[PDB]
Write a protein that binds this DNA or RNA. Structure first.
Length: 247
RNA sequence: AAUAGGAGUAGCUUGGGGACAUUCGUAUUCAGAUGUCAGAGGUGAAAUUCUUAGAUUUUCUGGAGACGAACAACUGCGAAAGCAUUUGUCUAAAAUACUUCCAUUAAUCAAGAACGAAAGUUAAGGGAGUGAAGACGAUCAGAUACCGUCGUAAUCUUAAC
RNA sequence: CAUAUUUGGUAGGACCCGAGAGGCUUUGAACUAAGCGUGAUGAGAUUGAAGUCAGACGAAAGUCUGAUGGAGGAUCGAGUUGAUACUGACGUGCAAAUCGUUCAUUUCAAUCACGUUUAGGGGCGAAAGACUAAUCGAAAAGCCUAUUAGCUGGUUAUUUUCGAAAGAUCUCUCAGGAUCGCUGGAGUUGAUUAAUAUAAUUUUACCAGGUAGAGAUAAUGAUUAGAGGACAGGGCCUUGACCUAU
RNA sequence: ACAUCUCCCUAGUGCAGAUCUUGGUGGAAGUAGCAACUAUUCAAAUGAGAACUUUGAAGACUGAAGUGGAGAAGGGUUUCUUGUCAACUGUGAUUGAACAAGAGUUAGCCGCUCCUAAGGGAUAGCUGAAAAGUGUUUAAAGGGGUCCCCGUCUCAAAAGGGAAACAGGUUGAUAUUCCUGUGCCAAUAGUAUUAUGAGUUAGAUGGUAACAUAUAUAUAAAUGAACUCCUUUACAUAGGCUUUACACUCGGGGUGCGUUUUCUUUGCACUUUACCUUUAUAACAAACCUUGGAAUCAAUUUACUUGGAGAAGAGGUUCGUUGAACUCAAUUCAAAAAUUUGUUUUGUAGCAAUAGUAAUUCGUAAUUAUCCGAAGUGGUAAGGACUAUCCUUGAAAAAAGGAGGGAACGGCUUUGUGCUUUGCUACUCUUAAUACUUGUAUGAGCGUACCAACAACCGCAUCAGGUCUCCAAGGUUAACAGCCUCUGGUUAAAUAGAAAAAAGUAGGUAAGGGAAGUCGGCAAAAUAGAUCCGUAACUUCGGGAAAAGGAUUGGCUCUGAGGACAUUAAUGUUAACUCAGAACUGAAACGGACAAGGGGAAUCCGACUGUUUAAUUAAAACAUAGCAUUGUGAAAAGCCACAACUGGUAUUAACACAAUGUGAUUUCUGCCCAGUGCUUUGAAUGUCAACUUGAUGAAAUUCAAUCAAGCGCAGGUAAACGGCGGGAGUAACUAUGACUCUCUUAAGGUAGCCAAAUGCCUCGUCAUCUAAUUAGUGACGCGCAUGAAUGGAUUAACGAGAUUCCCACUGUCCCUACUUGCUAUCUAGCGAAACCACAGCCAAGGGAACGGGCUUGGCAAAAUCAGCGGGGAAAGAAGACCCUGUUGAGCUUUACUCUAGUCUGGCUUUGUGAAACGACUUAAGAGGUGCUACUUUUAAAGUUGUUUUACUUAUCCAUUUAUAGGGAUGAAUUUCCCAAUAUGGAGACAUAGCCAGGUGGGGAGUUUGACUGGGGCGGUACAUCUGUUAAAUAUUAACGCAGAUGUCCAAAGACAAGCUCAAAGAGAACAGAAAUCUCUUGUAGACUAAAAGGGGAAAAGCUUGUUUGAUUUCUAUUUUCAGAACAAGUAGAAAACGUGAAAGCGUGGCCUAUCGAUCCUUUAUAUUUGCAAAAUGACGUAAAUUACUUACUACUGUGCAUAUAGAGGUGUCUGAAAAGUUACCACAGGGAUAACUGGCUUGUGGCUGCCAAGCGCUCCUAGCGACGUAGCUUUUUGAUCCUUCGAUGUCGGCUCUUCCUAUCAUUGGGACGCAGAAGUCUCAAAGUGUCGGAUUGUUCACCCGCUAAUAGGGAACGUGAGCUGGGUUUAGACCGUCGUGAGACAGGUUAG
């Protein structure tokens, strides 16, 4: 046929991210001597909204460590933090909400966010609204630490990786149902052109593997192999099992 | 100043009364190790089941939910439903004692209201064990049952009913 | 052997005209599609969500009544944006989609402008194989290319002479081809001696036949009747079978 | 200029045709036609000539959503004046957007020009043959300060940001642009003078505060560096409220004009004021401050907001609106201070009247007079203060400004090395002017006409089409609607007049009936505005709802209700429009025009609003929220793009991203993992590639062996694809079967549901609706073939949806009639085309089977005019249906062949060590065997292969401005201990390179027999063999007939010998019909491998003996036939044998069937050959000498190849390696070939006979009539395939006419089982007639009703340039069954 709808989405034309009103990337204060050997205290001056994600962004001011005057970063906000709060970052920073600490210095069973998947990477796991990770353990020789990502996997990271004490802001976002189509339109309008979806089975054959027939029947298995080639990947990708959940 | 009533005051008064935080124990189970070697589970009898890719069994680590025995009674508290690990915090409660205060403030109550086991419902988590449904193996003239093996929903917390 | 011409055969454009395509390289997003940026735009009405105030009731919890209020991809509606119905007008049009009347749409999944993004087995698609400049189940342009066609049409002065076939075998063969048959030309040989060769002929000899016919009492198969006799059931007798001549 | 025929060379050499090409031209024809957009008339001028040039007068229209002003894109001199008429200006034309000749566009301020956005193009790298693809991914890169700090370049807005301009006047054509006035903005160098004010003896003051302060021709001037920190620039949507401006209106004064018979203190016009002056002030919403200290809370807005974190009150300060408001300023006099308050006069506040406008006079340019006192409506626009909405929070920079910070700091004279010490006091700022030098020392370049559609654009053009923005008057009014009017514009459209008919088309209107019409209430009509009442089922409680259903409504004349101000409760001045009530009045009418809901009762589908097939389908399709599912923890991942490097999702991170299914709510979501998918474990495990490793060999080779994934083996999975049974028997009647038996499945349809868009049978059965019901609805449900996210069931709301009924209503219909505009018509003017072999009266006949011409008849008389649709198998256009092609294409798959990707192993890149493991080599013991060979253990020897690990320098990822060596909601700038590759991370694994296996409709290329009484299905008649058809040689056909073939056989072959069989009779213990035995009779009735036919008795049969000729080689030939091939034979020959005594006979089967080219492989054969300059037995045998010696020998390495001979197979059998689909389709053809008529025939249907056994009470025939038998007919259905495939428009209804008779009625008769009556059969009869409906797409059918009877037929199945389009037969769609799929359906249903 021709290039299928899934393939077209990737290809860097019109489907590029809806940039225009985004306020710039959220990534933690980069690693330095002052943080590594101690603590630096900063000021949250403002909390600002973001067209991409449910969590609000937090406007954080530091005073520079080798030049005069104040420099501004954008941190992703923990729930329960506030404008005019002092935010502290570093190895000696105290365990308190919205501070930024190495995971090696957590007491067990703390709830955290902004994990760096490997050290110094400025935060890359646990950023969506209402998520958290839990610290589950410290090895006897130290150096590594064991954490739990909110999907349900357990993961082991280096101890000196950063995280932020407290749950990610804007919790419960998908509790509220989207009542009408226009609200869904507005949700996708600030994200990515990906919607309305269009059922693949209703397409002509030329456009998609489910297409054709006279009852909109799938007509062959809905589970396709991990090994499947590019245009073939159709319904339930590489699935372990199908039908309703148990645990 | 009612062996009426309410209120007060007092005691290292009382108690598995309520709530929240908190903490520990054990089995069971999962995972990770460990050593073994043929059967192990299962029963009125057995089979379905699980097992040489090492089951069952041995001991250890880590995880997980559940429950909180024994002590425990012709015992305690709660309006009743109900309530049993540790400590803390917030709460109520009754009796006693009282040369303390108020002075009939009461009794029962259609209307109306608060709470209201268990199951069930709705929603999020959660999901060990148990286990309507269901699936088989048996038992029986027959068995949609009793018995057996597995096994969803429910059982647990939060938020509603 | 060389060479002249001829015809046939074979390759090429190869008797002339004719696809549907396939490949190669480019050119289009002024329409239109979707995305984006900067911007514009939507007469007038109607309903009357939350909150608020006042009144009323009740011991309580609570509940009612009147205002106020101004919510909603709410309602009707010009415009605007559409195209439902009239199978109305026109249908050698006013137009290669127009006209009249009717109708759907109007603060949002809204409409428009301009700028901008994505390009051909590609783009784009709230998905019709829709759309990508009157061109789309594979755009437009030129070239490979006079592509190729067992198929259709056409295929040009005269007189004269001879003149067919529509059988046959083989064929991924049944609209074709090959190859035999049947035809013309060229030539030699022979006849040219009322001849021998010879003949779609008869004759006299001599064979070979199993069709029309004819037969059932000749065989095989059918097939309708009785007559006369020496193996079976019942009570010399009955049904027969079975013979024999019919 | 031309011949050549004397002879002969040479060729792009001879046309009617090709839907030929090109150019020209007719009939059609003075015809079709010149129809939108309300509509013109009279007089005059110009001119040769005026319906459409100009002018006046009328009458009209556009009607501020305009043919009005401006502008954008595009056009491009279209503008203007002057000419002017060859062509054009579809009529005319003196006109003109035509033609000709000149002419016209003026900017510091309006734009562009500058900035950045979505984005573009480049630089660094890196890829790539290059072309190009990428845009910091290994940058020594553009600037600012004065050695330090910033830091990709560049383009991208004529509607975002944006230095500054307005008024009046003026030209034939421009004007925010020229002219006049007034300003504003930006520059404005150095040096020296001057003048302006500041500060000083290096930085002013006030104010409690919020904050204020420079008024100089000019508000100029209030120190400030590095470095910083802000802010303005700069932003959504909704809703109301409020303020100002403009607009509109009213009243009064003043001017002019108008009506002025009658009325009219009148109707109308005019009554002007810009930028600019931080505009001066006032006013007002806020904000903020000082005081003040608040509950019986207060203040307070339309709205709610606000307060001990300080409210009210009282006094202030500021911004923003505004832009002369306010006694504002100036002035005056009265009362003040060593410069105020009170009173007066001025000024359109300056700009400003000199400028405008309306007037009025005189010259023929000059004067005069006017220019202003009150107020309302709220239509526009801006602002202000706000409130609410969002799983949406609503650009950026250029540019400018403010602050923090505190670097730097008299002038002159002078010793000494910018510094130090001495002497002296106007110095430092700062505007503006001036002079001089310095290149010439003030304002760059580009745009500016006109149209902007009605004729300037695009649409082939002066095309009723399309095309962006602003401006918005009066009345009516909810109203920017519709109607009419003012300003402004027009009175022209590709023509006019006259006539007035059919027909057409855009309209009206109809008595009585009221859907009877029609597939269908389509069309048309009815309704409608408002106020006041009244408002159901049902409902997700929100709605349904304007439900339904009523009433009222004019004009006049009154009444009541609703405010604002200011006087000292009363008294006064004073504003709107909206409401409510009462009289009187009239042809009972009054939302009067315009505007403007039909409603109800139900079913089906879709929840909804949304969206879609541009130019046939708006929907039930699609989307949607919710539900449900799946992958993925990250740059060595998911998902996806790219040749490659590299990207995108990602400015991201599981409440995410990606991929699907389903489709609001409510209620539910059963069963099955066998089949196919998908998926999880592995060195026990079968297979499974390269490499490796060993063994063998002279080597090539040849052999083995090893832990890849994959599959297999073991599980998991159905909101994965999907799937979800059959018979019997059984209850006091019968019935049914709870109940039982039974075969069987992976499991056997549960909850539900229904003749539903799902039901074939089927118009199902029963109700009900109706008068009549294939329709509607409710039931019932052994259901061709319902059913649970492929969703089941129900649903309020919603629908340009599908369907039915009921009410209202009507010309839909009875049944049509009248009427109006515009056409048609005639004329003047202008003026095409399709089409066209030739043509054009018929009947019949024949003929390629329906002729205009042909034969025989009828017949046949110019020229014309208007209609019309019978025919011209009328036109269009190489049938789209069907078939055909060794033409295609789209699409699908477990078709054949592949392939990007992906997964996995190996080798490399790939270093450094450590340890463990194994193998191999060399030595010793134990076990078995025949000085030798084999098996098992031991060396822990050497060498080598492997698994685990440590290291980092290779390599890879991340990070930053590459920013301190490791341990113990202010401001912030000029320790101690240990040590002596930017930082982490990962790391010889990746990755990448090359091999190699798997996976691989994601994507590619291609194929997808033939015959064929259409094709497909079925079959094989495709290779063959018998008999028959075949017509007495031979020949010879059909999807003719009855059949057979793809083998079987060491004997069933070969030879000889012996014997005679089947059967029948008569006999013989057990013994019977069969058993064996015997005798007689026994020409074949047996047996002969197998079809069927031939042949066979001292055999060809049966029994027995001996055997292998079922052999090798070669001919001549027969059959089919081309007299090719194979195959099967027949006759021999040369060998060798077998048997028989011997002749003989034996070269497969008693004869007729039993089957296979080339290449290739494979194994046989040989004293045959090759491997391309040579050799390989063998220095063999003799000699010979010491050597490059001489003779002489059929037999001479491995491997490969030949030649000859078999065998491996092509059954579509003289031999391609090959599946489906198209209702999305294309093209070449076909009447060689279907679906339609006509034609032949008439099986089938229909109609008529003849017989006479019977029936008819008795009685053949009154009426009948079996058993039988003969015809007719072409209204049926077939059979057929002659005609048409470069198109005969495919069902039915409507309408309309004619023909027929096989008569239904009517007329006349005859017969009777005929009493009358009723009637049956029958003859002349085609004159005349043959109906209203219900239901269905219907032919047909069935009712119901009328009737005189509701007869049968024909005419290309009469009737589509008459209609209609409901059905069938395009594209969309739904459901079932069927198909893995694409898709299929003589099944249904819907838009077409």
């Amino acid at each position: 046929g021709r290039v299928i709808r899934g393939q077209r989405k990737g290809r860097g034309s019109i489907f590029k991210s809806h940039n225009h009103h985004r306020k710039g990337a959220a990534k933690l204060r980069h690693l330095d001597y002052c943080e590594k050997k101690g603590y630096i205290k900063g000021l949250v001056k403002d909390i600002i909204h973001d067209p991409g994600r449910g969590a609000p962004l937090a406007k954080v001011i530091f005073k520079r460590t080798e030049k005069y005057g104040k420099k501004e970063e954008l941190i992703i906000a923990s729930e329960g933090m506030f404008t005019g709060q002092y935010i502290s970052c570093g190895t000696k920073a105290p365990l308190s909400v919205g501070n930024i600490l190495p995971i090696g210095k957590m007491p067990e069973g703390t709830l955290i966010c902004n994990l760096e998947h490997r050290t110094g990477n400025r935060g890359t796991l646990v950023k969506a609204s209402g998520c958290y990770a839990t610290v589950v353990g410290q090895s006897e020789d130290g150096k590594k630490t064991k954490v739990r990502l909110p999907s349900g996997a357990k993961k082991t990271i280096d101890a000196k990786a950063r995280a932020m004490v407290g749950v990610v802001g804007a919790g419960g976002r998908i509790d509220k149902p989207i009542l009408k189509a226009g609200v869904a339109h507005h949700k996708y309008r600030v994200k990515r052109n990906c919607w309305p979806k269009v059922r693949g089975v209703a397409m002509n054959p030329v456009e998609h593997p489910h297409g054709g027939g006279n009852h909109q029947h799938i007509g062959h298995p809905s589970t396709v192999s991990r090994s499947a080639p590019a245009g073939q990947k159709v319904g339930l990708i590489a699935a372990r099992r199908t039908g309703l959940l148990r645990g």
